[PDB]
Design a protein around this ligand. Structure first.
Ligand SMILES: Cc1cc(C(=O)N[C@@H](Cc2ccc(C(F)(F)P(=O)(O)O)cc2)C(=O)N[C@@H](CCCNC(=O)c2cccc(I)c2)C(N)=O)ccc1Br
Length: 298
């Protein structure tokens, strides 16, 4: 895994000073320094013929080096491409698969990937539309008992539960070609603002704990990656994964490093963290969590 503790991990005390010494504008500049870095890798597959129509945004391709390949087949008008990237987690290879919000023409590709990669948990951090901007297609049966067919794969809703900041849906995927069934849990975070970033990270971190527990429980009953997506699969996705990694390190060694985590993540899911606000949010969220845990003395 590219996500190892250090070199130069930072403690909460050191993190406080680092942020004080820099302020909001400082952290904003730090984000621009990262954004200025030339991506490490290439994007030839994502921009090649036949795969262009599979990208929601022409300006958000995925890296060749880490793309998730679909074990497709010969002469049947299709490629092995899906805009999705394997992403490491804290001391864990391929902890997540960061991908864009499925398009009607890639719903089948999305579910095939879920099947082949043995995914048990899917995390969606957007609504289908926000501010008039389309962000994700309705790729799963919304209500209990309804089902959708994608070739030799059938997806059925076994139940839905609405929480204050997220919705949990249990889905059963039936691969009729291999005569096997699997239950997948789908979580849709509902508290990410249409504009800016959450004013408090409490909801997102609690949600992170919900997802971690479900993954742990599913894996125990079955590690496969957790699919995490937002419209382009880089902003909210990158934020969710970066926080998960930093928090993990913080719980194990009491240290972390936002700059390293984001820079490292950007070598697997290109462009992870789309705005300075989101970058700043990663720092602020960690400090807010620190205070809530009674670790901060002002
Ligand atoms: C020129 C062009 C732009 C867009 C677009 O609107 N892009 C959006 C895509 C996007 C990205 C992130 C989000 C998000 F953060 F909300 P999420 O949480 O759902 O992930 C939503 C939507 C955008 O803002 N574009 C970004 C682009 C990101 C960086 N890319 C590049 O610039 C780039 C492209 C190719 C090669 C190289 I080297 C770099 C921007 N402009 O801020 C689409 C088609 C075309 Br043609």
């Amino acid at each position: 895994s590219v996500h190892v503790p250090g070199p130069h991990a930072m403690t909460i005390q050191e993190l406080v000073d680092y942020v004080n010494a820099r302020q909001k504008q400082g952290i904003y500049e730090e984000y621009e320094d990262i954004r200025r870095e030339n991506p490490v890798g290439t994007f030839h597959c994502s921009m090649s013929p036949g795969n262009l129509e599979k990208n929601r945004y022409g300006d958000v391709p995925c890296l060749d080096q880490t793309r998730v390949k679909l074990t497709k087949r010969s002469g049947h008008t299709q490629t092995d491409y899906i805009n999705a990237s394997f992403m490491d987690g804290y001391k864990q290879k391929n902890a997540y698969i960061g991908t864009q919000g499925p398009l009607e023409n890639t719903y089948r590709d999305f579910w095939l990937m879920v099947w082949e990669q043995k995914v048990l948990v899917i995390v969606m951090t957007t609504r289908f539309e926000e501010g008039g901007r389309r962000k994700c297609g309705q790729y799963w049966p919304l209500e209990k008992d309804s089902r959708i067919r994608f070739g030799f794969l059938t997806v059925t809703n076994l139940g839905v539960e609405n929480m204050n900041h997220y919705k949990k849906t249990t889905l059963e995927i039936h691969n009729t070609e291999e005569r096997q069934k699997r239950q997948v849990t789908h979580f849709q975070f509902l508290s990410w603002p249409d504009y800016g970033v959450p004013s408090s990270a409490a909801s997102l971190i609690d949600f992170l704990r919900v997802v971690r527990n479900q993954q742990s429980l599913a894996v125990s009953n079955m590690e496969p990656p957790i699919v995490v997506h937002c419209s382009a699969g880089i902003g909210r996705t990158g934020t969710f994964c970066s926080l998960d990694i930093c928090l993990a390190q913080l719980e194990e060694l009491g240290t972390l490093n936002v700059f390293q985590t984001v820079s490292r993540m950007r070598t697997q899911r290109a462009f992870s963290i789309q705005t300075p606000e989101q970058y700043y949010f990663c720092y602020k969220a960690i400090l807010e969590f620190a205070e809530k845990e009674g670790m901060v003395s002002a």
